[PDB]
Structure formats: structure tokens, C-alpha cells
Design a protein around this ligand. Structure first.
Ligand code: NA
Ligand code: NA
Ligand code: NA
Ligand code: NA
Ligand code: NA
Ligand code: NA
Ligand code: NA
Ligand code: NA
Ligand code: NA
Ligand code: NA
Ligand code: NA
Ligand code: NA
Ligand code: NA
Ligand code: NA
Ligand code: NA
Ligand code: NA
Ligand code: NA
Ligand code: NA
Ligand code: NA
Ligand code: NA
Ligand code: NA
Ligand code: NA
Ligand code: NA
Ligand code: NA
Ligand code: NA
Ligand code: NA
Ligand code: NA
Ligand code: NA
Ligand SMILES: [Zn+2]
Ligand SMILES: [Zn+2]
Ligand SMILES: [Zn+2]
Ligand SMILES: [Zn+2]
Ligand SMILES: [Zn+2]
Ligand SMILES: [Zn+2]
Ligand SMILES: [Zn+2]
Ligand SMILES: [Zn+2]
Ligand SMILES: [Zn+2]
Ligand SMILES: [Zn+2]
Ligand SMILES: [Zn+2]
Ligand SMILES: [Zn+2]
Ligand SMILES: [Zn+2]
Ligand SMILES: [Zn+2]
Ligand SMILES: [Zn+2]
Ligand SMILES: [Zn+2]
Ligand SMILES: [Zn+2]
Ligand SMILES: [Zn+2]
Ligand SMILES: [Zn+2]
Ligand SMILES: [Zn+2]
Ligand SMILES: [Zn+2]
Ligand SMILES: [Zn+2]
Ligand SMILES: [Zn+2]
Ligand SMILES: [Zn+2]
Ligand SMILES: [Zn+2]
Ligand SMILES: [Zn+2]
Ligand SMILES: [Zn+2]
Ligand SMILES: [Zn+2]
Ligand SMILES: [Zn+2]
Ligand SMILES: [Zn+2]
Ligand SMILES: [Zn+2]
Ligand SMILES: [Zn+2]
Ligand SMILES: [Zn+2]
Ligand SMILES: [Zn+2]
Ligand SMILES: [Zn+2]
Ligand SMILES: [Zn+2]
Ligand SMILES: [Zn+2]
Ligand SMILES: [Zn+2]
Ligand SMILES: [Zn+2]
Ligand SMILES: [Zn+2]
Ligand SMILES: [Zn+2]
Ligand SMILES: [Zn+2]
Ligand SMILES: [Zn+2]
Ligand SMILES: [Zn+2]
Ligand SMILES: [Zn+2]
Ligand SMILES: [Zn+2]
Ligand SMILES: [Zn+2]
Ligand SMILES: [Zn+2]
Ligand SMILES: [Zn+2]
Ligand SMILES: [Zn+2]
Ligand SMILES: [Zn+2]
Ligand SMILES: [Zn+2]
Ligand SMILES: [Zn+2]
Ligand SMILES: [Zn+2]
Ligand SMILES: [Zn+2]
Ligand SMILES: [Zn+2]
Ligand SMILES: [Zn+2]
Ligand SMILES: [Zn+2]
Ligand SMILES: [Zn+2]
Ligand SMILES: [Zn+2]
Ligand SMILES: [Zn+2]
Ligand SMILES: [Zn+2]
Ligand SMILES: [Zn+2]
Ligand SMILES: [Zn+2]
Ligand SMILES: [Zn+2]
Ligand SMILES: [Zn+2]
Ligand SMILES: [Zn+2]
Ligand SMILES: [Zn+2]
Lengths: 172, 172, 172, 172, 172, 172
């Protein structure tokens, strides 16, 4: 047992390791999306920039969870980072919809983590999740939903002009 | 169902709409108080300034709740903003006591909202309430209680000199 | 009778109270419109910003009328602020058309107020209306008419691209 | 009953008074440690500085709890501040281990306080504890654990060179 | 015996430990007074500020005595810090009178300490007391006497207006 | 075939995808090492900082290879990022030796990549490897070899003082 460990349940430690893997996976998904839009036959530089920024953000989320794991005296156990579901993300609208799906999945995982911390009476972990992850997820989901709405209303994916102008005016 | 909606109960959405109305109502009450003290036969400019500032603050609280409602994918339903209970607020001390009563009512509504969010296992909403409303209410109630105490100790409302000097030295 | 009251007819005082309510109502309508465009399934941030600014402006108009009421020695009597006619404003073009209708209604009320002040030989009130409200209404109506014209010419509401680009280039 | 008191249980008020005493006690313990390292036969100035800073920090924690007690309308009841368990803290490593023990005791008290506030449905008090005390305790415990680990690995307390160099390089 | 000890009598060392406790006690008394005036039913913020400043000053006095004890090679022995005589200080005037009584008690203790240092032919300790404590006590006593005189002359404690205006104009 | 593809062999494209995976793997290894040294029972903050910096650098190397793949008209195919070989890196010296082994492995992969590009007569790819990767690997290997030499000469891993002072003076 770690000399710093106090009120930190083994179930919570395991769930934090699972969340670390999920954040690293999300980072990898966004990296794949970013370099899809960097292809010469897609060529939407601001979509590429948007998703690269998200990928770096998800890496930061993972590192904050690793820092928490050490702060509480749990032990980090890393796992394989699985490859993303797609190599070809088909369009800006499809990538935004996949990102929305992924962010809602990550949010569900975080809500389950909060439920576990509540059940184990770990208010520090509950506060950590609420303070650093829950509103970040709500904001990310709202932003992605807005992007999806605008792309659809503009005529994406059938209108390449729609994605070009969205790339310029919203993501630029 | 909104594409962004996740873990947002219909009861919580309804209670947020009720709180929006309550904040707009509080804004209206403070506006009435402010312009009562702007009357030529009352003529306490810093009481008027104090309550105008509170009115603008309550409008901001309402707008933050509307923003939350959209962030979570709920739908804003506005209602009539009822007129304040008084047209004549009788004195600075009476207006401060009415404001204290109103802030404790709003606080009770927020505590009921927090209880509902806890019962529906919505930690994001609980965190939103705690972070942006609960300590604001506690601070507002403590400030109003202090003002009431000082006005009473100075001899208000029978001493017009008391309210004049309080207007100058505490609210100025 | 107020010690400051001079040449201020009771009919004028009543009409000023009615105008105060109308300005607060207009503020509420614009607030509703603003947060309609903040929805994730509408997602036009600059429409939302435009109407929020108008809502704050209408609150300022109401407060200037309350200040006038006290300056002249009349007494403010507040009434319920009725809810806006719509919860769903359907599109940027429809909201702009409703705003144009509302501003022309407010202008008609102000012209009736000016007629009353003229009939009661209250040149200070006539000057107040002309100086602070009449050209503001004419400018607001012309601006809204311009917005409606451009949205229609661009193909709104059927073209979501039209409202997206109007949001970006005119309202942004 | 205080005019500001709302949703503040007498048990919570009593537990806050107990925590105030515990924070003042911790401040006294750290003060004793600091001036132990200021002795001419110990002479570790940066250990002395470290513990003096902690003592002032614990005084600040106590004052924030007193401020909370008044904000909620509870009444502060002070008790004797008991003397620290030791006059002679024997070594830098022993003092760091005693500080780690003390911080884990204070953390346990704060977790019991949070459990009580949760049981009494006082979300403002829960938020106060989480926001201002729980992560502070986790960070303090992790820091002390790190210091203990490094001192042990360097050969303290048998190596006076170890504590000298730790004083210079980590605490300086 | 400490390697630095020279011309430092054991009686002087004991009396310095007693003075350390007395200064810490005075700090605690002032802390209690400060947060009495922070209550919502007392609400005199500048009285609260005044006594908080005095409390921090008394902590500094205690720390300077601890530093002296180590400089001379004596050993600090801490004792319990007894709780203050009152929880409720009843009024600004009563608190100022209690503070005057406390400062005269501390001054008497310091004069006895000086007499002891003179009797033991310890000129360094005599100089320390004269330089850092005696005129500080005389100035504090004169200031408190002035405050008491002004509060009484203004009509305190029966006049709440008196304490309000003293809080504003003398302590603000 | 990509419209930009010229003199880019399918074997080279495959080897670039393999190198992308190897760089991401190296980033993950360094991340694991970094947070090993962040544990409370290891507590070497500058080792942790060193390896975190290396992890971010390896992510940058991977992204530059992905950028190259798109510049040449090849297609990125991502694979699973395998977990690092160790969860516990045992000591600063052992982690530095593992890092040296890993960097020499990555260097061997890059030399094989250069041999392939030479065999396929792809001077742009050869230049890319030489310019951005080969001297970076040589410098990294020399730096790690220096660190290993110094840690061994200082007495690591048996001397915890050795790793403490190396952490302070070389990595700090
Ligand atoms: Na996954
Ligand atoms: Na999903
Ligand atoms: Na989805
Ligand atoms: Na879900
Ligand atoms: Na109401
Ligand atoms: Na009058
Ligand atoms: Na109430
Ligand atoms: Na009340
Ligand atoms: Na209540
Ligand atoms: Na109306
Ligand atoms: Na939708
Ligand atoms: Na109209
Ligand atoms: Na119209
Ligand atoms: Na008309
Ligand atoms: Na204790
Ligand atoms: Na010695
Ligand atoms: Na403990
Ligand atoms: Na311990
Ligand atoms: Na415990
Ligand atoms: Na005493
Ligand atoms: Na005395
Ligand atoms: Na006295
Ligand atoms: Na005496
Ligand atoms: Na590998
Ligand atoms: Na350990
Ligand atoms: Na190797
Ligand atoms: Na090697
Ligand atoms: Na080799
Ligand atoms: Zn351990
Ligand atoms: Zn994330
Ligand atoms: Zn971060
Ligand atoms: Zn740890
Ligand atoms: Zn473990
Ligand atoms: Zn593992
Ligand atoms: Zn995927
Ligand atoms: Zn494609
Ligand atoms: Zn906890
Ligand atoms: Zn936390
Ligand atoms: Zn919807
Ligand atoms: Zn409010
Ligand atoms: Zn706000
Ligand atoms: Zn929405
Ligand atoms: Zn709904
Ligand atoms: Zn409605
Ligand atoms: Zn009312
Ligand atoms: Zn009146
Ligand atoms: Zn939630
Ligand atoms: Zn939240
Ligand atoms: Zn009047
Ligand atoms: Zn938004
Ligand atoms: Zn208007
Ligand atoms: Zn104005
Ligand atoms: Zn008036
Ligand atoms: Zn009237
Ligand atoms: Zn009315
Ligand atoms: Zn309407
Ligand atoms: Zn609609
Ligand atoms: Zn006139
Ligand atoms: Zn005029
Ligand atoms: Zn124009
Ligand atoms: Zn355009
Ligand atoms: Zn009370
Ligand atoms: Zn503390
Ligand atoms: Zn503080
Ligand atoms: Zn109080
Ligand atoms: Zn009480
Ligand atoms: Zn007591
Ligand atoms: Zn102790
Ligand atoms: Zn010792
Ligand atoms: Zn509460
Ligand atoms: Zn909570
Ligand atoms: Zn709180
Ligand atoms: Zn000694
Ligand atoms: Zn206060
Ligand atoms: Zn003193
Ligand atoms: Zn000092
Ligand atoms: Zn000494
Ligand atoms: Zn001694
Ligand atoms: Zn003792
Ligand atoms: Zn006392
Ligand atoms: Zn009292
Ligand atoms: Zn001497
Ligand atoms: Zn001296
Ligand atoms: Zn004087
Ligand atoms: Zn292609
Ligand atoms: Zn590399
Ligand atoms: Zn790069
Ligand atoms: Zn390409
Ligand atoms: Zn290909
Ligand atoms: Zn693949
Ligand atoms: Zn490995
Ligand atoms: Zn290990
Ligand atoms: Zn080439
Ligand atoms: Zn060459
Ligand atoms: Zn090249
Ligand atoms: Zn050294």
C-alpha cells in the first residue's frame, strides 16, 4: 500500500486506468481524423487543425488522469491503444458525427466513473471528475453538435462548397 | 431528442425552466426597488445603485441557466415575469429585508434543484449549481443580513439620518 | 403630488408606464430569440449575439423611461412582463421579420405617446421622445428591413447556406 | 436563529468548530517543527522555512472555516489549542513523517465532515469542503510522501549529509 | 548545554517560554474578537479587520520570542493555548476595553521579564525586550485607550450609530 | 493513385507506416517512464520531466512522418500502439538504459528505412530521413549514453543519493 493512499478504492483505481486508456484512444482517433483531412484528395486544412488540437487535448486529459492516479497512491497500468475504427473518415460531416459519438461515449464512461466514486464515498475523486472532465465533455458535445447542425444545414456532405466554406468560416 | 442530450432528465429540464423564471422575477424585483430609491421623495442614490446592480446580476444568472439548458439539449420555455409584490418599498431597511427574504427563497429553490439533480444522478448539473449559484446565494444572503443588521443598529427606518449615512458610507 | 411635478399630466404618466412595460416585453422577446439561435439544432451564434444585444438595449430603453418617470414626479407602476408569442422562432429570417414587426409596433406606441404629449402641451416629454426614441426606432426598423431583404435575396429560409453566410458576413 | 441561516444543521456547525480547532492545532504543530529546525544543534534553515510556511497555511485554513461558520449563520466556539506531541522532532525525516501522519489525520477529519454534510443534504458545505480542502490535502500528502521517499532513499536520518543536501536542493 | 549559550539563565529561558505562550494566547483572543465582529448580527467589518491584524501581529511577537530563545541557546517548550475568556464580545467598545486590559497584562508580564533579565545581568535580553516589545506595548495601550475614549464619548455601546461611524471613520 | 504521387514506392509507403507506429510506441514508452518517476515511492521529478519531454518529442516525430506520407501521396494506415514492456521501470538508471535500448532500436529501423529508400532510388525520402531523423537519433543516443555513464559512475542504482543528485544537477 502506498504511503499516500487514503480513501482510494481499488475499483476506483481500476476505473481510472480504464479512463486513461479511453482518453489515449480518443487522442489516437482524433489524430487519424486530422491527417485524413491533410490528404491531397481531401485538403481541408482547418478540419485537420481542429482535430489535431482535439488530439493534443485528449492526450492532456489522459496525463491529468495519470497524475491523479499517482496523487492518490494508485498505480498506473497501461494497455494497448487500439487503432481507430476507420482509416477513411469520408467527409468533414462524417468525421464530426463520429467525434460527437466518441465524445458521448467518453462522457458516458466519465458518468459511470462518477457513479462509482459516489458509491465508494470518494468525494475528492468526484470533485476531480466534475471539475476537470464533466463540463469539458458537455462543452465538447455541444460544440460538435453545433458543427454537425451547421454542416447539415449547409448541404454537406454532398456540397463540397459547404465543407469548404465551413472549413474557412467556422474552423478557420 | 437533441443530439447533444445525455443524462438530462425531463424533470431537471423543467426545474431549470422554473429557475430561469425565478431569476428573471428576482431581476424585476430589484429593478423596482432601485427605481423606488430614485424617487424624489426617497432620494437615496446609492440604494438605487445597489439594487440596479443586483437586478443586472439576476439577469445574468437567468442567462447562464438558459445557456445551460441549451448546452444539455433541453428546451427553454419562458413564462410571464410576474410583477413585484410592492410598488412602494417604504424604506431602505424594508427593501433590504425584502431582498433578504427573496434571496433566501431563491436559495431554497436552488437547493431543491440540487436535490433533484442528485436524485436523478446528474453530477454535471449538481456541479453547475454548486459552482455558479450556491455560494453566490450564501454570499448574497450574508451581505444582506449584514446590511439589515447595520441599518437596524443605526436606528432605521425611524432615523432618516441612519439611512442617509448608510447610503453614503456602506453603499457609496 | 410630487414636489417636482410640473406640467406632467396623469395621462402622460400612465402612457409612460405602458411604454415601460412594452420595452421590457421587447427585451424579453429578443432574449427568447437569442437563445433560440443558441440551440444545438439551430446553432447560429451571431444571430444569438445580435438578439442578445437588442435585448440588453431594450432593457436600457425601459430604464430610461423609468428614470424619466421619476424626473417628472410621476410614479412607476410595473406590470407583468408577458411571455413572448413564440418559443420556436423557426429561422433567422422569421426571427428578423418578427423583430421588424415588433419594432414597428413599439414605434407606433411611441408615436401615440408623442401625440399625447403634444395634446397635453408637454414639450419636455415630446423632446424626450424625439431625442431618445424616435430616431432609434427608425434606425432599428431600417436595419431590420435591410436584414430581411438580404436574407430573402440570398434564399433564406430554404437555403441554410444563406443563413450561415449571413450569420458570418453581416452579423459577424 | 441567525437571520442568514438556511439548511445548516447543528451537527454540521459543531463539526466545523471541531475542524477549526484541528486546523489551529496543525498550525501549532508546524510552528513547533519549524523552530526545532532553527535550533543551533539542528540548523536546517530550509526545513524551518518549509514548516513555518505550512504553519501559516494552516492558520489560513482555520480562518476560512471561521469565515464559513459566520457565512452560514453558525456560531464559532473556540477551544484550547493543545500543545504538539513532541518538543524534539529528532530529524528532518522524522518531522516529515509526523507531518504526513498529521495531514492524513486532517484529511480523515475532512472526509468525515464531507460525509456529514452529504448526510444532512448540505451541498454548499460539501462544495466548500471539496473546493477548498480536499485537493489541498491530497496535494499536501503527496508532497510529504515524496519528501519522505527522497529522504529515505538518500540515507536519512543516519546520513546528516542526506538531510543537509535535501535541505539545500529540495527545500531551498 | 548549547554550544551558543552564554550568560543565559535558566530562569530567563523559562520566562521566555511563558511569554511565548502569552503572545500566542493574545493572538487567539484577537482572532476570536475579529470573527465576533464578522458575525451577521454584529457586522462591523473594520473592527473585524482591526482585530485580525492584531492577531497576526501577536503571532509575529511570539515567533520573535521563539527566535530569541534559539539564538541564546535556550530550548522552546510549548504549552496549550487556552481558549479566550469570551465567545461573545458584546460590542465594539467592550472588545476594545478587553483588548486594553489584555495589552496591559502583556505589558506587566514584559516588565516582569525585564526585571528578571536585569536581576540576572543579561543586558542582551534587556535590550531585546526594550527594543522590540516595551514601546510596542506602550503604543498599543495608548491606541486602545484612545479608541475607548472616542467610543465612549460618541455614545457607545448604546448608540449603534456610534460604533458604525467609529468603524467607518477611525478603523476604516 | 494519388494525383501528387511520384517516385514513391509502395514498399516505402509501408515502411513509413511501420515507422509511424514505432514512433507512437516510443512516445508511449516514455510516457510510462515519466509517470513511473512521478510515483510517491520514486519521486524523481526531473526524471519525470525528462521522459515526458521525450514522449512529446516522439509524438512530434510520428506526426512529421504522417505529414510526409500525405505529402508524397501515400496513405496512412494506423495500427494498435502496443503497451510498454514494463509498468515498473525500477530506477532512473534502468529507465535510462531502457531508453538507450529503445533509441538504438528506433535508429536501426530508420537505417533500414534509409536503405530501402536508397534501393528504390527515392532521394527525397532519403533526404527526409537524414535531415529530420538520423542526427536526432545519434544525438539522443549519445545523450542517453552520457546519462547512463554518469549514473553508473555515481553509484546508481544502489545509491539513492546518486539518483537524487543526478536528478537535481543534470536533469534539473
Ligand atoms: Na476504447
Ligand atoms: Na456515443
Ligand atoms: Na452521437
Ligand atoms: Na449514455
Ligand atoms: Na416567482
Ligand atoms: Na416630498
Ligand atoms: Na425566504
Ligand atoms: Na428573511
Ligand atoms: Na428554507
Ligand atoms: Na406587450
Ligand atoms: Na439535430
Ligand atoms: Na407591427
Ligand atoms: Na413588419
Ligand atoms: Na402604424
Ligand atoms: Na487535535
Ligand atoms: Na552542539
Ligand atoms: Na494519520
Ligand atoms: Na502516515
Ligand atoms: Na483514514
Ligand atoms: Na494566558
Ligand atoms: Na490588565
Ligand atoms: Na484596562
Ligand atoms: Na501593572
Ligand atoms: Na514496437
Ligand atoms: Na513508500
Ligand atoms: Na537496441
Ligand atoms: Na543499448
Ligand atoms: Na543495430
Ligand atoms: Zn508505494
Ligand atoms: Zn477527454
Ligand atoms: Zn492538463
Ligand atoms: Zn503515488
Ligand atoms: Zn495499487
Ligand atoms: Zn500494464
Ligand atoms: Zn474510432
Ligand atoms: Zn475519402
Ligand atoms: Zn476522497
Ligand atoms: Zn478533487
Ligand atoms: Zn434538437
Ligand atoms: Zn440569482
Ligand atoms: Zn454570467
Ligand atoms: Zn441545445
Ligand atoms: Zn426538451
Ligand atoms: Zn413557453
Ligand atoms: Zn416581490
Ligand atoms: Zn415610500
Ligand atoms: Zn450529468
Ligand atoms: Zn458542471
Ligand atoms: Zn412625492
Ligand atoms: Zn454553444
Ligand atoms: Zn426600445
Ligand atoms: Zn440609457
Ligand atoms: Zn420622483
Ligand atoms: Zn403619480
Ligand atoms: Zn404596479
Ligand atoms: Zn412575441
Ligand atoms: Zn426550429
Ligand atoms: Zn413640459
Ligand atoms: Zn426633453
Ligand atoms: Zn441603412
Ligand atoms: Zn463566403
Ligand atoms: Zn444572530
Ligand atoms: Zn489544513
Ligand atoms: Zn484563505
Ligand atoms: Zn453570521
Ligand atoms: Zn448557533
Ligand atoms: Zn468556546
Ligand atoms: Zn503533534
Ligand atoms: Zn534533536
Ligand atoms: Zn446548503
Ligand atoms: Zn457532489
Ligand atoms: Zn460552497
Ligand atoms: Zn544543543
Ligand atoms: Zn461578511
Ligand atoms: Zn504582543
Ligand atoms: Zn517579527
Ligand atoms: Zn539554539
Ligand atoms: Zn535548555
Ligand atoms: Zn512542552
Ligand atoms: Zn480572553
Ligand atoms: Zn453580541
Ligand atoms: Zn547578555
Ligand atoms: Zn538585544
Ligand atoms: Zn496617540
Ligand atoms: Zn487520392
Ligand atoms: Zn523518434
Ligand atoms: Zn515536428
Ligand atoms: Zn496526400
Ligand atoms: Zn496508397
Ligand atoms: Zn489501419
Ligand atoms: Zn517498452
Ligand atoms: Zn520501483
Ligand atoms: Zn524522390
Ligand atoms: Zn545521399
Ligand atoms: Zn527531403
Ligand atoms: Zn550537491
Amino acid at each position: 500500500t502506498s504511503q499516500v493512499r487514503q480513501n482510494y478504492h481499488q475499483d476506483s483505481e481500476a476505473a481510472i486506468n480504464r479512463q486513461i486508456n479511453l482518453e489515449l484512444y480518443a487522442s489516437y482517433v482524433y489524430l487519424s481524423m486530422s491527417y485524413y483531412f491533410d490528404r491531397d484528395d481531401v485538403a481541408l486544412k482547418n478540419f485537420a487543425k481542429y482535430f489535431l488540437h482535439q488530439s493534443h487535448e485528449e492526450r492532456e486529459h489522459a496525463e491529468k488522469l495519470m497524475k491523479l492516479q499517482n496523487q492518490r497512491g494508485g498505480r498506473i497500468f497501461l494497455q494497448d491503444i487500439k487503432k481507430p475504427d476507420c482509416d477513411d473518415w469520408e467527409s468533414g460531416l462524417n468525421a464530426m458525427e463520429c467525434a460527437l459519438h466518441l465524445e458521448k461515449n467518453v462522457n458516458q464512461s466519465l458518468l459511470e466513473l462518477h457513479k462509482l466514486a459516489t458509491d465508494k464515498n470518494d468525494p475528492h475523486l468526484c470533485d476531480f471528475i466534475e471539475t476537470h472532465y464533466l463540463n469539458e465533455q458537455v462543452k465538447a458535445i455541444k460544440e460538435l453538435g453545433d458543427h454537425v447542425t451547421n454542416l447539415r444545414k449547409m448541404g454537406a456532405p454532398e456540397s463540397g462548397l459547404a465543407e469548404y466554406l465551413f472549413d474557412k468560416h467556422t474552423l478557420g
